[PDB]
Design an enzyme around this catalytic site. Structure first.
Site, mmCIF file in Angstrom:
data_model
loop_
_atom_site.group_PDB
_atom_site.id
_atom_site.type_symbol
_atom_site.label_atom_id
_atom_site.label_comp_id
_atom_site.label_asym_id
_atom_site.label_seq_id
_atom_site.Cartn_x
_atom_site.Cartn_y
_atom_site.Cartn_z
ATOM 1 N N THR C 1 16.092 29.433 -3.320
ATOM 2 C CA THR C 1 17.496 28.945 -3.113
ATOM 3 C C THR C 1 17.895 28.885 -1.651
ATOM 4 O O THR C 1 17.694 29.838 -0.891
ATOM 5 C CB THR C 1 18.506 29.791 -3.903
ATOM 6 O OG1 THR C 1 18.212 29.660 -5.298
ATOM 7 C CG2 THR C 1 19.946 29.335 -3.654
ATOM 8 N N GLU C 81 8.702 32.025 2.692
ATOM 9 C CA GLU C 81 7.832 32.979 1.970
ATOM 10 C C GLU C 81 6.348 32.772 2.291
ATOM 11 O O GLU C 81 5.804 31.681 2.093
ATOM 12 C CB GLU C 81 8.045 32.897 0.444
ATOM 13 C CG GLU C 81 9.361 33.537 -0.003
ATOM 14 C CD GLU C 81 9.696 33.216 -1.445
ATOM 15 O OE1 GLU C 81 8.876 32.576 -2.129
ATOM 16 O OE2 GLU C 81 10.793 33.578 -1.892
ATOM 17 N N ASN C 200 5.050 35.402 -5.158
ATOM 18 C CA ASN C 200 5.574 34.654 -6.309
ATOM 19 C C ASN C 200 4.889 34.911 -7.645
ATOM 20 O O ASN C 200 5.270 34.312 -8.660
ATOM 21 C CB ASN C 200 5.617 33.171 -5.948
ATOM 22 C CG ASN C 200 6.701 32.885 -4.929
ATOM 23 O OD1 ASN C 200 6.429 32.549 -3.775
ATOM 24 N ND2 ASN C 200 7.941 33.111 -5.329
#
Lengths: 193, 198, 202, 193
Positions: C1, C81, C200
């Protein structure tokens, strides 16, 4: 009565020979050149190809050849895609088909280059080692045969990052058969036409 | 790169082979999507020797070619680079069959869905985020998501699952029609990354 | 997000702020593409207090909001990430601006391109394979590509020296020229690393 | 001398307060609730939002709010997206905006729910811990100040998987400023309208 069976491939149906050889295209020494040969009496063929707007030399060659609806042979290599290699790469593809046609003609079956499909797989952007490939061509024509192991070798020779080969055959109860081999473990999202 | 050679001893003209091949490729190879990268060399060839002397009914020739290609696709999926999960993404209840295929591919290619899968995580949130980006007819309030037959999301919200095994089915119903489609894919593993970077 | 809040003490009516924000978002956030997954929550807000009592010219308000958004996009890319490579994909010589953007995004999202970059590997063939799938006007014989300024692809074939191009540094620029017009576009992306997968999949 | 300066954010321009608190939304107990407050005199606002057809409750609520062109505050939480949470999740978004507006009204500035934009980030599908959130709203409103540290705490409070906050301000040579904070390190490919 119909049987779909793994561990059988391109030489399961009658009228086909195949082989795979190590031609030294791969640094590892593994099998890297496959040949599939139709013995007749018929030579009907169809084909579908990547919809990628960047197409390798062997795709462009084989797309042209398939417009005839006729094939005598398919020659396939691993250890290099012959992709993004320009007109010189396309000349190498043509030279491979001509070499297969000449080897088959010498072996006893009159063949022209236009009757030979060409496939390649591996790294994009390098040209093929033609001395090795052409030497391999002569070799593989003299190894091809109708036995199931000939199919096995061809299935092994087309592998790149695959760990195992892929083969299956459908034996129809009406006494005809469809055999197949495939490879591909990565860059694997076909879109064919 | 995916290369495939098919052969037959059925008696069939090139037009008969073309039909069987194009139908099979649409249903099988075209719905195999491991890493969403389509190659410069993919080729599928189908040759006939006619050595049997038997001309099959076209429907039977088509079905035989389909069964072979579909099994080959299964084998390709099972040996994919870095595979730890053999994943099928089924979309049902779409406006059209093409909508369902588009939805299924959107989900299958999504990097967060693929990593959740590598982690054995029934993450329906990531599935919904993914399918929400598909360019199709969609009602967020009508979507259901199932993992291995267990509904975890119904009507676009969490329902009021062990994914440790290698085989995972994700099924998403869109509730806006009867279109359905299915994609064979795999997870995004460290093994994938290492094979493709080292 | 991605969430972003912008504030200004410039005096501006809602419509002026809307123009500023839409123009900036299209050029910045909409061209920031880390892992190809668009979220259910993304929001960008632009608030004005007008406490400065100065009403800037529209062009000046636009430019300021643009510069701010572009800098935040650089910061978001840099802390993505599992990031190891800050990758910028530029496409030039496209038939349209939209074609260049579609091209740039096709490359940026490709898992094989991204894993090659994680490996510092100038596997330029993967860039050609990716771009050939973009639903755009393309001529494969006119594609040229540079990595960090060094030629890897010329008129659709390999450049001499391509495979020795050094990508060891964290910043990587890919420029792809399509030779079919003058449409251009740039995407900020990152590589696909073990760190990304670990984060993830936990 | 127009300058673009990092480590400065939403409280760099005049007329803005902010804060960030640990409301206990995150198990870690990191900062997880941020407030940006507009002091006026003007309240003009514009917004763009995800083009995803699946939109979180706070996106739906804020799109609605933004049709007025007017905002007095933005409340933002991490530790939960409040996404795919149904009518009750949307109610939770409204309850947050109501809570902020009440707290501002008690602070000294009369404010209604429709003046309060709401943003969320975190896991999809889970409901917010409302007791904790609402207690945090009371705290954050009492903490808000116009100092840079206020903007800084807010930039920290919106982080999820981020390792650092993202902030910048542009100080125009005509004596006005644009400030910004952002977050987002994955599921990061915006498509806005």
């Amino acid at each position: 009565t119909t049987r779909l069976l793994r561990a059988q491939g391109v030489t399961a149906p009658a009228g086909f020979r195949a082989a795979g050889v190590a031609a030294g295209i791969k640094a590892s020494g593994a099998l890297d050149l496959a040949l599939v040969f139709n013995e007749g009496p018929d030579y009907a063929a169809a084909g579908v190809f990547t919809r990628n707007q960047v197409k390798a030399a062997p795709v462009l060659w084989t797309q042209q050849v398939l417009t005839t609806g006729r094939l005598r042979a398919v020659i396939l290599n691993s250890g290099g895609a012959n992709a993004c290699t320009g007109p010189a790469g396309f000349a190498d593809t043509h030279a491979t088909a001509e070499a297969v046609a000449a080897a088959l003609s010498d072996w006893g079956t009159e063949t022209g280059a236009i009757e030979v499909a060409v496939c390649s797989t591996g790294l994009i952007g390098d040209r093929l080692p033609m001395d090795k490939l052409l030497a391999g061509v002569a070799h593989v024509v003299h190894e091809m045969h109708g036995g199931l192991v000939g199919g096995d070798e061809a299935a092994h020779a087309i592998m790149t990052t695959d760990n195992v080969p892929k083969q299956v055959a459908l034996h129809h109860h009406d006494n005809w058969t469809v055999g197949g081999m495939a490879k591909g473990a990565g860059m694997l999202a076909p879109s064919l036409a | 790169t995916m290369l495939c050679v098919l052969t037959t001893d059925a008696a069939a003209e090139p037009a008969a082979l073309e039909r069987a091949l194009r139908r099979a490729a649409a249903a099988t190879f075209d719905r195999l999507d491991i890493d969403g990268s389509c190659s410069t060399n993919d080729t599928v060839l189908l040759l006939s020797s006619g050595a049997s002397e038997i001309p099959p009914a076209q429907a039977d020739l088509d079905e035989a070619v389909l069964r072979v290609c579909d099994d080959l696709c299964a084998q390709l999926q099972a040996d994919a680079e870095g595979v730890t999960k053999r994943v099928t993404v089924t979309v049902t209840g779409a406006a059209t069959e093409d909508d369902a295929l588009v939805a299924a591919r959107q989900i299958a290619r999504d990097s967060l869905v693929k990593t959740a899968l590598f982690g054995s995580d029934p993450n329906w949130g990531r599935v919904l985020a993914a399918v929400g980006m598909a360019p199709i007819t969609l009602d967020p309030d009508r979507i259901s998501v199932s993992f291995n037959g267990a509904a975890v999301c119904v009507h676009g919200v969490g329902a009021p699952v062990d994914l440790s095994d290698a085989d995972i089915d994700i099924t998403v119903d869109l509730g806006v029609g009867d279109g359905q489609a299915r994609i064979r894919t795999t997870d995004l593993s460290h093994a994938y990354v290492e094979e493709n970077s080292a």
